[PDB]
Scaffold this active site. Structure first.
Site, PDB file in Angstrom:
ATOM      1  N   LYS A 209      41.521  49.563  60.485  1.00  0.00           N
ATOM      2  CA  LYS A 209      40.083  50.485  60.326  1.00  0.00           C
ATOM      3  C   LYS A 209      39.850  51.290  61.619  1.00  0.00           C
ATOM      4  O   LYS A 209      40.483  51.254  62.634  1.00  0.00           O
ATOM      5  CB  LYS A 209      38.965  49.367  60.073  1.00  0.00           C
ATOM      6  CG  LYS A 209      38.975  48.968  58.760  1.00  0.00           C
ATOM      7  CD  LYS A 209      38.010  48.018  58.277  1.00  0.00           C
ATOM      8  CE  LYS A 209      38.288  47.235  56.997  1.00  0.00           C
ATOM      9  NZ  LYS A 209      36.935  46.654  56.996  1.00  0.00           N
ATOM     10  N   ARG A 243      41.674  39.282  55.801  1.00  0.00           N
ATOM     11  CA  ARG A 243      42.183  40.182  54.993  1.00  0.00           C
ATOM     12  C   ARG A 243      42.978  41.162  55.677  1.00  0.00           C
ATOM     13  O   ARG A 243      42.290  42.008  56.425  1.00  0.00           O
ATOM     14  CB  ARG A 243      41.202  40.877  54.113  1.00  0.00           C
ATOM     15  CG  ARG A 243      41.672  42.085  53.359  1.00  0.00           C
ATOM     16  CD  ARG A 243      40.464  42.699  52.286  1.00  0.00           C
ATOM     17  NE  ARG A 243      40.769  43.599  51.589  1.00  0.00           N
ATOM     18  CZ  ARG A 243      41.089  45.106  51.696  1.00  0.00           C
ATOM     19  NH1 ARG A 243      41.011  45.497  52.887  1.00  0.00           N
ATOM     20  NH2 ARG A 243      41.467  45.761  50.886  1.00  0.00           N
TER      21      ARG A 243
HETATM   22  N1  LIG Z   1      36.112  41.413  51.673  1.00  0.00           N
HETATM   23  C1  LIG Z   1      36.594  42.682  52.289  1.00  0.00           C
HETATM   24  N2  LIG Z   1      36.427  42.808  53.480  1.00  0.00           N
HETATM   25  C2  LIG Z   1      36.773  44.174  54.131  1.00  0.00           C
HETATM   26  O1  LIG Z   1      36.463  44.369  55.400  1.00  0.00           O
HETATM   27  C3  LIG Z   1      37.138  45.257  53.054  1.00  0.00           C
HETATM   28  N3  LIG Z   1      37.634  46.702  53.646  1.00  0.00           N
HETATM   29  C4  LIG Z   1      38.197  47.258  52.726  1.00  0.00           C
HETATM   30  C5  LIG Z   1      38.675  48.426  53.322  1.00  0.00           C
HETATM   31  N4  LIG Z   1      37.463  49.199  53.788  1.00  0.00           N
HETATM   32  C6  LIG Z   1      37.453  50.122  54.964  1.00  0.00           C
HETATM   33  C7  LIG Z   1      36.352  50.148  55.708  1.00  0.00           C
HETATM   34  C8  LIG Z   1      36.218  51.274  56.815  1.00  0.00           C
HETATM   35  C9  LIG Z   1      37.422  51.605  57.015  1.00  0.00           C
HETATM   36  C10 LIG Z   1      37.316  52.628  58.458  1.00  0.00           C
HETATM   37  O2  LIG Z   1      36.297  52.564  58.991  1.00  0.00           O
HETATM   38  O3  LIG Z   1      38.422  53.238  58.980  1.00  0.00           O
HETATM   39  C11 LIG Z   1      38.539  51.367  56.567  1.00  0.00           C
HETATM   40  C12 LIG Z   1      38.621  50.627  55.511  1.00  0.00           C
HETATM   41  C13 LIG Z   1      38.179  46.821  51.367  1.00  0.00           C
HETATM   42  N5  LIG Z   1      37.960  45.779  50.881  1.00  0.00           N
HETATM   43  C14 LIG Z   1      37.384  44.744  51.678  1.00  0.00           C
HETATM   44  N6  LIG Z   1      36.873  43.671  51.469  1.00  0.00           N
END
Ligand SMILES: Nc1nc(O)c2nc(CNc3ccc(C(=O)O)cc3)cnc2n1
Ligand SMILES: Nc1nc(O)c2nc(CNc3ccc(C(=O)O)cc3)cnc2n1
Lengths: 263, 263
Positions: A209, A243
């Protein structure tokens, strides 16, 4: 489902949106997705989180028919070719429902039961496990950010319970990267152990992220040692499940951390 | 020398024993050693720990003439070709003395001033920095292991002070892998933050050690994610300097950890 407290469990990520593949038409994408899941299981994944919509920032919304067309065939092959629990990464109750009829174990809801009023009763109806993740639009918090997150969990947990979800089925996740800027994400990671007071298993996702990218300004895949850092700190703070995109590397770090803090 | 508290500092390992080279005769070993140091500096090492005797278990003792023959030419080239502080990994006062005359900055003593009665006055004499590492033979402790370690530091610190070493020159290290079995090593890592009470900068070394290998039974170089775990936990527990084989990877994890806990 997992024996919480015995060790850290690893959730591997399987995204099957079109952008996830070299060729988003190719009729072989189904087999590619399954090979990727076989690889993660061999690297030591405990559960696979399958998503047909990306919740990564500025990816588009998918209608639930489209979302099901992407995930249904993958769930069917996973269930016959692979002895591994599956998590369905969806905030839509109709998607969750179909997935759960096919034998998915957990709904991973990145809106924490708030985006679809039917989601709680679907979870109850199938006796599913659910991950309730904290999320909001924008980055404003009138209270202490950890107090808001805990308040949010309390409300979502009560929604779940009003629909007969058992307490033992719930996992909480603070939602790194969602409704939070850099400083807030840092702060939540720093204070993550305060979530242990609610009494529920915790799931953390940071892999690749932008919160890591801001400290380590390299391309997403090259942020692995940042992600390993958050895995390690997370486990020390009470995290039960991480995850991750890179299953083997995070599992190896998690075993080292488990040997130091778990009894 | 370092601005302690601002961030985590990385010490790269440079061993120049014969077994360290493909060809332990080759007259080009000096240039190979220097290339390795240039690489670690480019990967972000803050200091290079040069050793001509291996303190890795069941390596042989080297007499100090032999030890100096290995390290003197490397120190000279480092000092002219590379703008980087150097640490001399020796418990022998005569080795330290020669190194310090050539402009080495720190003596890294894996016997914590106890193996050579002249070591303390050599450090004082050159106004050097010293790392005082805890060590003993065998694994018996009549007191609490962390109480013994702290007692040992107190005595070594008093030896240093009786020879006019300034307090600001001392760094302490709990000596993972030395005089400690698996469980004791685990315990020291778990309790490492108790060493912060003594008020001194802390140095940690775990890289590739058998304590990690017992959790992750792969060959030493493949223990990197275990080492990254101990780097990360160490920094959270107050560690200032980590001594590592893999400089880039540990620095990236350290920056992620620094961003979460350092102010
Ligand atoms: N339970 C759960 N927990 C997470 O943390 C999660 N993240 C993502 C992916 N989400 C992101 C959010 C922010 C960013 C960025 O800032 O780069 C990248 C990916 C998808 N499912 C998810 N499920
Ligand atoms: N300051 C400092 N701190 C260390 O931790 C260290 N370690 C070594 C290398 N020592 C060992 C010890 C044990 C083991 C094993 O169990 O495998 C391996 C290597 C050499 N110099 C060192 N200097």
């Amino acid at each position: 489902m997992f024996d919480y407290g015995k060790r850290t469990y690893i959730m591997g990520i399987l995204n099957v949106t079109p952008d996830s593949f070299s060729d988003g038409g190719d009729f072989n994408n189904l087999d590619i997705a399954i090979q990727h899941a076989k690889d993660m299981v061999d690297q030591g994944a405990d559960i696979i989180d399958l998503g047909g919509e990306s919740t990564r920032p500025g990816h588009s919304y998918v209608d639930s028919d489209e979302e099901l067309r992407r995930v249904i065939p993958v769930i069917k092959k996973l269930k016959q070719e692979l002895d591994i629990p599956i998590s369905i990464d969806t905030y839509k109750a109709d998607v969750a429902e179909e997935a759960l009829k096919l034998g998915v174990t957990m709904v991973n809801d990145v809106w924490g039961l708030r985006k679809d009023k039917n989601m709680a009763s679907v979870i109850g109806k199938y006796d599913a496990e659910v991950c309730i993740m904290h999320n909001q639009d924008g980055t404003n918090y009138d209270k202490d950010i950890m107090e808001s997150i805990k308040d949010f969990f309390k409300v979502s947990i009560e929604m779940a319970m009003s629909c007969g979800v058992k307490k033992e089925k719930i996992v909480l996740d603070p939602g790194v990267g969602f409704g939070k800027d850099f400083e807030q994400n840092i702060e939540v990671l720093r204070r993550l152990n305060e979530l242990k007071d609610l009494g529920y298993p915790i799931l953390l996702g940071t892999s690749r992220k932008s919160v890591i990218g801001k400290v380590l300004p390299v391309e997403p895949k090259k942020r692995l040692e940042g992600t390993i850092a958050t895995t390690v700190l997370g486990i020390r703070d009470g995290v039960d499940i991480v995850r991750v995109h890179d299953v083997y590397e995070n599992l190896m770090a998690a075993r080292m951390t488990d040997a130091i803090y778990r009894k």
